[PDB]
Amino acid sequence: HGHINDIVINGVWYQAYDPTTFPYESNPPIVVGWTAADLDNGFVSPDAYQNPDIICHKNATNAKGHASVKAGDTILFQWVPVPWPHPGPIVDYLANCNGDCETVDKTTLEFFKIDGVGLLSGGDPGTWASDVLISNNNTWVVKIPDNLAPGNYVLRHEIIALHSAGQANGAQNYPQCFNIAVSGSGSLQPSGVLGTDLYHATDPGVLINIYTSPLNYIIPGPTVVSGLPTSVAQGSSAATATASATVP
């Protein structure tokens, strides 16, 4: 259980959507994170993998502004509370909004995977991407590909928790969506997968007992786009300035 508090893009801090705070406010701010109904810091289960909730979390509605970034920039995700409690993989996707992300229909977004880390070593439980996130003060770093075509994209970051995944419907997915506007020199525009086609309840990395050794792990979802590292070097860094979500 947790949620993202902020993202830091080359040192520039943005307030994320806070489902533990904003729903209680009269007039919550416009932010780069989508509005969602994870007030309990909870998850989407496999029985909702074919439901709109898996796209950007429960009942999600579009963030009403965006963060402008350059292709090649790195984005740090800050999860709270510290520490994240569960073992599992971490993945990141982009989907072109084909227009403003503030008004895109989320059910049309076709996600391509830009990073994904699973089981790093061992078993029962082993060391996972989540352990790296915990070590780095509850952060994960993704790089927007240097050659990504200019456009507006939803960035879908997700931790999957596997401590209860040995049973049907036991995996727990924690997607978090953000609006970005990307500038750059490249033309990369990878083939994506609809959110409700990403995962199935019987996938080998979804229905899995991690309390066994030796252990292997197939990260769910499509391949990381060719030519991208499956992760860039992890490590937390501080923000040096703050910005607000830019409205169209």
Ligand X SMILES: *[C@H]1O[C@H](CO)[C@@H](O)[C@H](O)[C@@H]1O
Name the site residues for Cu ion (rule: CB under 5 A). 1
Instruction: Point out which span in 78-86, 115-123, 200-208, 223-231 binds ligand NAG (CB under 6 A).
Output: 78-86
Q: Pick the binder of ligand NAG from 130, 138, 172, 231 (CB under 6 A).
A: 138
Cβ contact 96:102 at 8 Å: no
- Min. distance of Cβ 125 from ligand NAG in angstroms? 24
Residue with tokens 């990878």: 190
Torsion of CA 94, 95, 97, 102, to 10 degrees: -60
- Residue 223 CA to residue 218 CA, distance in Å, equals 10
Instruction: Point out which span in 77-85, 153-161, 164-172, 218-226 binds ligand NAG (CB under 6 A).
Output: 77-85
Nearer to ligand X, 133 or 161 (CB): 133
Residue 188 contact among Cu ion, ligand X, ligand NAG, none, beta carbon within 5 to 8 Å by kind: none
Q: Which residues pair with 79 in a beta bridge?
A: 4
Q: Is 174 annotated as a binding residue?
A: yes
Residue 70 contact among Cu ion, ligand NAG, ligand X, none, beta carbon within 5 to 8 Å by kind: none
CA distances for 38 relative to 43, 56, 243, angstroms:
7, 10, 25
Counts for the chain of helices (H) and strands (E), in that order:
2, 13
**47 φ, ψ to 5°?**
-70, 0
Residues in contact with ligand NAG by the rule CB under 6 A: 5, 37, 58-59, 78, 80, 82, 137-138
- Extract the annotated binding site for O2: 163, 172
- Extract the annotated binding site for Cu(2+): 86, 174
